[PDB]
Amino acid sequence: DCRYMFGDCEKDEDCCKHLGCKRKMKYCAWDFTFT
């Protein structure tokens, strides 16, 4: 299943679709895009 916020991620696919992967934190954030 997907990972929600603070869950580990390689790519955004690892995270839920309500989220995005922060490669800086290696965890899913609510977005991946820097904004």
Residues 6+ apart with CB under 8 A from 2: 14, 15, 16, 17, 19
Indicate the domain borders of the chain: 1-35
With b for 16 or more beta-carbon neighbours within 10 A and e for fewer, the 6-34 pattern comes to: ebebeebeebbeebbbbeeeebbbeebee
3-state secondary structure the chain: CCECECCECCCCCCECCCCEEECCCCEEECCCCCC
In whole angstroms, give the CA distance from residue 26 to residue 28. Answer: 7
Give the up-direction half-sphere exposure of residue 34: CA atoms within 13 A in the CB hemisphere.
3
Q: How was this structure determined?
A: NMR
What are the beta bridge partners of residue 10? none
Q: Which of 26, 6, 23, 18 is nearest to 34 (CA)?
A: 23
CA distances in angstroms from 5 to 9, 35, listed in the order given: 10, 17
Which residue type occupies 26?
Answer: K
